[PDB]
Amino acid sequence: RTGYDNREIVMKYIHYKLSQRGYEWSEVVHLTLRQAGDDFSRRYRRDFAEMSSQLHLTPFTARGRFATVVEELFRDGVNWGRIVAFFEFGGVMCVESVNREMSPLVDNIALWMTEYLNRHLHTWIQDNGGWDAFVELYGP
Numbered sequence: 001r002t003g004y005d006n007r008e009i010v011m012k013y014i015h016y017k018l019s020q021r022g023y024e025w026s027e028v029v030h031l032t033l034r035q036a037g038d039d040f041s042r043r044y045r046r047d048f049a050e051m052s053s054q055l056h057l058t059p060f061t062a063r064g065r066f067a068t069v070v071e072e073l074f075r076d077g078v079n080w081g082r083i084v085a086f087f088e089f090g091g092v093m094c095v096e097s098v099n100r101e102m103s104p105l106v107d108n109i110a111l112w113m114t115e116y117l118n119r120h121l122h123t124w125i126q127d128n129g130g131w132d133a134f135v136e137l138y139g140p
């Protein structure tokens with residue numbers, strides 16, 4: 001169903017983000033999310049450089065960091081751009097975890113991302129046409 005899609009969408013996104021850094025951890029939705037995320041990460045490159053320096057990820061701090069950042073991200077509601085930002089931020093947390101020899105946290109972050117999508121973003125996504133609408137709007 002939709003939830004099986006979301007977990008797959010998270011796993012394929014993280015897998016690509018980590019592969020970009022040399023770490024080995026329909027498809028139109030995945031391709032669209034990759035391309036939109038790559039655009040987002042270039043546009044907001046400076047923002048992520050600043051935020052990554054403020055995260056201080058450890059196994060003890062990671063869950064709280066994820067929770068507070070994502071709550072700030074969606075403070076004014078949901079739209080597709082913020083959903084892209086959510087994936088990009090999760091990708092950044094995963095890359096930082098690997099950078100810090102904390103690679104097991106990738107699995108935790110993937111689970112947190114999946115549970116946030118299924119519990120908090122699923123209603124908006126379906127209310128706004130599902131992932132198919134995202135592909136229509138921003139796909140190649």
Ligand SMILES: O=C(NS(=O)(=O)c1ccc(NCC2CCOCC2)c([N+](=O)[O-])c1)c1ccc(-c2ccc(N3CCC[C@H]3c3ccccc3Cl)cc2)cc1Oc1cnc2[nH]ccc2c1
Binds near residue numbers: 048069085
């Ligand atoms: O309204 C917004 N966005 S939109 O819906 O109009 C729209 C616009 C364009 C696109 N697609 C562009 C295509 C794609 C195909 O290829 C060709 C171009 C899409 N999309 O694809 O969905 C949607 C909008 C809301 C929020 C923030 C935003 C959030 C968070 C942050 N920060 C930066 C640091 C981390 C994060 C953060 C900050 C505070 C708290 C937590 C966090 Cl994590 C910065 C900006 C930016 C927004 O603008 C953009 C601008 N360009 C973007 N490009 C891709 C996504 C996108 C979003």
